[PDB]
Design a protein around this nucleic acid. Structure first.
Ligand SMILES: Nc1ncnc2c1ncn2[C@@H]1O[C@H](COP(=O)(O)OP(=O)(O)OP(O)(O)=S)[C@@H](O)[C@H]1O
Ligand SMILES: Nc1ncnc2c1ncn2[C@@H]1O[C@H](COP(=O)(O)OP(=O)(O)O)[C@@H](O)[C@H]1O
Ligand SMILES: [Mg+2]
Ligand SMILES: [Zn+2]
Ligand SMILES: [Zn+2]
Ligand SMILES: [Zn+2]
Lengths: 79, 563, 490, 73
DNA sequence: TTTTTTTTTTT
């Protein structure tokens, strides 16, 4: 869908970029389960790496400079 | 107190009423008393008087029509309501319309100055749009409100016009009348837009356009993509929002095709074999009986192209067309064949396409780099006047049942080659947009010319690697003509000779039989048969399909775009 | 004489001819047997009253047979003959069922198949105010709005209700000055005594391939009143029968520059034209060998593939959508996914299942969910149904599965294992239902399926999607001499 | 507003205690002060008010005749 | 608050 971490997408109405907090910002203290750890989008995998590193997601792009606290638990399954 | 005799109008009405009865054809037998016969059965209300005969019978009159055609039109129609009372079965409040034709002298959409308003002209152009048909109020019957009387016969002029005087000395509302609508007089009204024809465009100019207004039984003669020839009067029209600003409008009365392929009057073999003039029919027969015909149409259609004898044949078989069938379930088999050309630079590709598009009638020509998706197939446009989204016809539609010539087919974008495949497959065009839902027919045959990837055609690869079309499209053609410039020398003498001949004897050295006008006739005739298959031919066909698959068989050789 | 020298509209409006017509219709209603000695309008009125329907059908041909003069008066001035026939059928029913006054106290007579079927582009000004029968697809429908029928205002200075004016569908009704306090002013309606009636507007347009031969398809408006509303949905093929009524519009006059009026069909009878005992089926099912006999009944033309015939037949009837007692929600839909090189009648397998099945829809993959749309008629920004909610119980035929977009792919998988969609769109947050069986066909990469790799490679599809399909048929090809004749000959 | 009170503009005449009708229906301010044509305005200080929401009700899923999108009120 | 065409910044 939108992704795991946040994205910056060109809104049809605004014609400008908006911020999409994905799953790891909606899970507050909860737990996130993942499968096929090589299928996730390259950008998305980079961002999940940083999110498990720092425990927050901070995108600095076209018109977006915000921070979202990621507080969840990763239960990953590899292949 | 009483009204004034518009003498120049009534004298003309009288002389026209006389002409209608006195003028007779080659064998006595007054002709405007038999064409005016069918004028009684419902839905017919226009008599078509030729203008050259009104020149024979009289000449002090023609110069009154052709100079006051708007003053004296409301009278040349009453003088047809009296001449037709001799039938007694017409509803007494029905009204008729005179429609001229065959004017001597033509004009151009750029010669329509403002010194022409109110006269009788004649115009030729294409047709771009066609709005829907409407009723229009010509003479309202205002039911008075306080008197309960009926104010009657009030003429509108581009507005509702609300006549405000009553013949009753006690009319409490000289500003209020509820008109009825079951006695008033309506006439149909269609408004189309025409665009300057091709052969008149001054070089380096964008074509102009004007509004014509068909207003009678003539209301759906012109359709989009046609090349009709209108004959009416130029009028001025106000801006009714503030009733100033005026704008020109053509008010056509008759409309007819510009060059009839059969000059009788304008759909099977007999309906057409009737209009065939004696020489026409003794020539078409002669050709149909001709042997080696299949080699005198090539030599007579493309007279300035040395060689490629296997491409002209395909182009011909594309022009004649196959048999279109409809399966009982509701589907439909494609009837016409599509053809693509692919070759080295300067091998006469665009010349086949230009030949076909200048010969054939109703065949359109487009390049690939300067087109669109919504321009080929069909568009959606917001008419703010009606403030609605309506459908605009595209190049694949205003060439219907003809040929669409696409040059440089592989320059089109990735998304513009998709809309064309969606049409080439189902022979239709779907539209699903703002407020529009429709399915349109498209039975065109496509003739496309393309270029191999990286200039030259490499003869060690399949086709799919030499051209950048999609995968589905390359399946919907089923005739390819790969041209190559084999570096030879006996040809490089022949082509040289032919080109220098053509350039030295500009209009001669072209000795084709079957002049181009004649082939159009033969091709409009022979395109109305539906040949069948005999059992022996069916056996032959299945055997040939057997003998074609196995050539592609494994081991010995290889070919491109597998069978 | 029932025909004198006046206008047909004004002949019937006179008291004499009115009463004559009134009494003439009763004698036909009461006494009309049809080839068996059955008073058809005795059993038919009954079957109407056993349902509380207040709508009576009058086949036109029999009216012409038993009545020579009315069936010629009718399509000339039908705004009054269809009013007189109402009061006739009333007094008939209130005699066959004297208590029916407690059910709607008003009867409308429809009329079935006038002999003058017509096109939708050939309506000219000759037909203003004349009964008409046409045909064509319907492409819109507003909601069933209530319209005033017998309005009744109340004065603001006297607490007295004005006269019960009737509402005509061309001009807002205009009350005069209060006959009790002469307080001419802006009155307001009185919601308690006013009578209302249903209302719906549709836009009919020419059938796709019927008459639209070499031109664009025209359209028209229609107005369905009380009993008729919701007789047809966008996509249906109907055949109206209604007065062709015009009315003045001020906008068209300001666009075309000439006095031009709008037209609309006040529909009077809507009869759809679409697709709608066991004792044989007992032994036919008890043949014990109905399998072979049914397999070669689907795929009627396309030769071969008695393999995939089996799977698709399995899919068509379906299975059993049992509800597990452990709250696990197993699904009862069979989803199929064809695949194979181009030229093997996949698309035909889709199109024939479009026909044989019922309530089926269709789409290509090159609209899947409900989306906000500005209505053609109502001009409001409503929500319109997609392409997975129109198969909420039937089948969904997807074509060009590969050409789907990322949003389309992330939206298709949700409905497989959940069969339920949420829409938190600009319109409003809803959660609707979608129970459909998916029948799609993908393509092989490289223009040919090559069975060295697994199928999960030549399909070019996301891996957790193929799991959401039950059957995986692979169409393939080979140069085979003995079948070349078999397919060619066919 | 449930119990509203108005006032003239020029002569400053009041006509108070006016009661609105419930539901979604407004009110027709006089034009005959007893002063120019419509001299009446609302006095915001004296008007009793009550809350009101506006929901949107969709029909149950198992009662749609299954060809279309459910209707709402 | 919808198409369609054309230019320039952005993921
Ligand atoms: N076989 C031929 N016989 C006679 N004239 C020829 C022949 N081949 C080429 N010509 C002439 O050479 C020119 C060919 O140019 P075109 O046919 O317009 O270009 P083309 O074949 O479309 O190639 P490109 O890809 O578009 S440059 C024309 O002037 C032709 O008259
Ligand atoms: N075995 C067959 N029997 C009958 N028709 C066939 C057969 N194989 C191919 N066809 C023809 O091929 C067409 C189907 O092509 P299609 O499968 O739609 O191509 P694609 O899969 O590339 O869209 C049909 O219209 C049919 O006429
Ligand atoms: Mg070229
Ligand atoms: Zn008067
Ligand atoms: Zn009053
Ligand atoms: Zn005052």
């Amino acid at each position: 869908a939108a992704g795991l971490t946040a994205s910056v997408m060109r809104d049809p109405s605004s014609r400008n970029f908006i911020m999409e907090g994905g799953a790891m910002v909606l899970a507050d203290g909860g737990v996130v389960c993942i499968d096929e750890f090589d299928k996730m989008r390259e950008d998305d995998r980079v961002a999940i790496h940083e999110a498990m590193e720092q425990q927050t997601i901070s995108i600095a792009k076209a018109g977006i400079t915000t921070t979202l606290n990621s507080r969840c638990s990763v239960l990953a399954a590899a292949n | 107190h009483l009204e004034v005799r518009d003498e120049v109008a009534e004298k003309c009405q009288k002389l026209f009423l006389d002409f209608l009865e006195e003028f007779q054809s080659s064998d006595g037998e007054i002709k405007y008393l038999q064409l005016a016969e069918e004028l009684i059965r419902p839905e017919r209300n226009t008599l078509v008087v030729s203008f050259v005969d009104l020149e024979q019978f009289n000449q002090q009159l023609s110069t009154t029509i052709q100079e006051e055609f708007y003053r004296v039109y409301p009278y040349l129609c009453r003088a047809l309501k009296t001449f037709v009372k001799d039938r007694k079965e017409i509803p007494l409040a029905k009204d008729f319309y005179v429609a001229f034709q065959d004017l001597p002298t033509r004009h151009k959409i750029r010669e329509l100055t403002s010194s022409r308003i109110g006269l009788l002209t004649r115009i030729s152009g294409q047709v771009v749009r066609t709005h829907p048909v409407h009723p229009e109020l010509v003479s309202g019957t205002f039911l008075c409100l306080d008197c309960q009387t009926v104010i009657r016969d009030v003429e509108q002029q581009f507005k509702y016009t609300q006549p405000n005087i009553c013949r009753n000395p006690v009319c409490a509302n000289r500003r209020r009348f509820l008109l009825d609508t079951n006695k008033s007089r309506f006439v149909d009204f269609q408004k189309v837009r025409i665009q300057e024809t091709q052969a008149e465009l001054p070089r380096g100019s964008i074509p102009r356009s004007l509004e014509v207004i068909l207003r009678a039984e003539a209301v759906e003669s012109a359709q989009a993509g046609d090349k009709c020839d209108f004959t009416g009067t130029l009028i001025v029209v106000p801006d009714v929002s503030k009733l100033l600003s005026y704008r020109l409008v053509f008010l056509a009365c008759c409309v007819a095709p510009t060059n009839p392929r059969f000059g009788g009057k304008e759909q099977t073999a007999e309906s057409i074999k009737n209009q065939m003039t004696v020489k026409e029919w003794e020539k078409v027969f002669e050709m149909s009986q001709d042997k080696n015909l299949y080699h005198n149409l090539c030599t007579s259609l493309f007279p300035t192209i040395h060689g490629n004898d296997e491409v002209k044949r395909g182009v011909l078989l594309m022009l004649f067309g196959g048999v279109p069938k409809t399966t009982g379930e509701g589907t439909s088999l494609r009837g016409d064949i599509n053809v693509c050309i692919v070759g080295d630079p300067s091998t006469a590709k665009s010349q086949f396409l230009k030949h076909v598009e200048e010969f054939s009638p109703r065949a359109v020509y487009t390049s690939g780099k300067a087109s669109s998706a919504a321009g080929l197939t069909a568009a959606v446009v917001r008419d703010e006047e009606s403030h609605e989204f309506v459908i605009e016809a595209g190049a694949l539609m205003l060439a219907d049942n003809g040929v669409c010539c696409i040059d440089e087919f592989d320059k089109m974008d990735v998304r513009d080659q998709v809309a064309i495949h969606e049409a080439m497959e189902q022979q239709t065009i779907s539209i699903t947009k703002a407020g529009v839902k429709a399915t349109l027919n498209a039975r065109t045959s496509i003739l496309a010319a393309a270029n191999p990837i990286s200039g030259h055609y490499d003869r060690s690869k399949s086709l799919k690697q030499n051209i950048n079309l999609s995968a589905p499209i390359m399946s919907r053609f089923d005739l390819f003509f790969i041209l190559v410039d084999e570096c030879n020398e006996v040809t490089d003498y022949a082509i040289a000779r032919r080109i220098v001949d053509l350039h030295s004897r500009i209009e001669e050295s072209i000795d084709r039989v079957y002049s181009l006008d004649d082939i159009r006739r033969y091709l409009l005739f022979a395109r109305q048969f539906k040949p069948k298959i005999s059992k022996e031919s069916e056996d032959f066909i299945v055997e040939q399909y057997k003998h074609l698959r196995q050539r592609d068989g494994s081991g010995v050789t290889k070919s491109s775009w597998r069978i | 004489e029932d025909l004198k020298g006046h206008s047909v509209r004004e002949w019937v409006s006179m008291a004499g001819p009115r009463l004559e017509i009134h009494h003439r219709f009763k004698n036909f209603l009461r006494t009309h047997v049809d080839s068996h000695g059955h008073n058809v309008f005795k059993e038919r009125i009954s079957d109407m009253c056993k349902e509380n329907r207040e709508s009576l059908v009058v086949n036109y041909e029999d009216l012409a047979a038993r009545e020579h003069v009315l069936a010629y008066f009718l399509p000339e001035a039908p705004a009054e003959l269809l009013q007189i026939f109402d009061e006739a059928a009333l007094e008939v029913v209130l005699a066959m069922y004297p208590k029916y006054d407690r059910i709607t106290n008003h009867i409308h007579v429809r009329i079935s198949h006038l002999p003058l079927v017509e096109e939708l582009r050939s309506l000219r000004q000759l037909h203003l105010n004349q009964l008409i029968r046409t045909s064509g697809v319907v492409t819109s429908c507003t909601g069933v709005l209530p319209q005033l029928s017998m309005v009744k205002y109340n004065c603001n200075k006297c607490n007295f209700v004005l006269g019960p004016f009737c509402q005509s569908q061309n001009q807002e009704v205009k009350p005069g000055s209060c006959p009790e306090c002469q307080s001419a002013g802006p009155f307001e309606v009185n919601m308690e005594e006013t009578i209302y009636q249903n209302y719906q507007r549709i836009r009919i347009q020419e059938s796709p391939g019927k008459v639209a031969a070499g031109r664009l398809p025209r359209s028209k408006d229609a107005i369905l009143l009380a009993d008729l509303v919701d007789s047809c949905k966008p996509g249906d093929e109907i055949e109206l029968t209604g007065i062709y009524h015009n009315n003045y519009d001020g906008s068209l006059n300001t666009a075309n520059g000439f006095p031009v009026f709008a037209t609309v069909i006040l529909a009077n009878h809507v009869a759809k034209k679409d697709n709608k005992d066991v004792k044989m089926i007992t032994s036919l099912s008890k043949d014990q060998q109905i399998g072979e006999k049914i397999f070669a009944s689907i795929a009627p033309s396309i030769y071969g593939h008695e393999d995939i015939k089996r799977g698709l037949a399995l899919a068509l009837f379906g299975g059993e959508p049992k509800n597990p007692g452990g709250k696990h929600k197993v699904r009862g839909d069979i989803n199929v996914l064809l695949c194979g090189d181009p030229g093997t009648a996949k698309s035909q397998f889709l199109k024939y299942i479009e026909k044989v099945s019922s309530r089926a829809i269709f789409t290509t993959g090159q609209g899947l969910t409900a989306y906000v749309q500005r209505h053609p008629v109502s001009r409001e920004w409503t929500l319109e149904a997609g392409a997975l909610v129109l198969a909420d119980r039937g089948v969904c035929l997807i074509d060009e599965f590969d050409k789907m977009n990322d949003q389309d792919r992330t939206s298709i998988h949700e409905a497989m294992e959940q069969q339920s969609i949420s829409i938190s769109k600009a319109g409003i947050v809803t959660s609707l239902q979608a129970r459909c069986t998916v029948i799609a066909a993908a393509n092989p990469i490289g223009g040919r399926y090559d069975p060295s790799l697994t199928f999960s490679e030549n399909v070019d599809l996301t891996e957790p999607i193929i799991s959401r399909f039950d059957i995986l048929c692979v169409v393939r090809d080979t140069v085979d001499p003995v079948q070349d004749e078999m397919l060619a000959r066919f | 507003a449930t119990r509203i009170s108005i006032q003239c503009r020029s002569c400053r005449n009041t006509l108070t205690n006016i009661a609105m009708r419930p539901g979604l229906e407004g009110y027709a301010l006089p034009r005959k002060c007893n002063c120019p044509l419509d001299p009446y305005f609302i006095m915001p200080d004296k008007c009793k008010c009550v809350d009101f929401q506006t929901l949107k009700l969709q029909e149950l899923p198992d009662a749609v005749p299954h060809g279309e999108m459910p209707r709402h009120m």
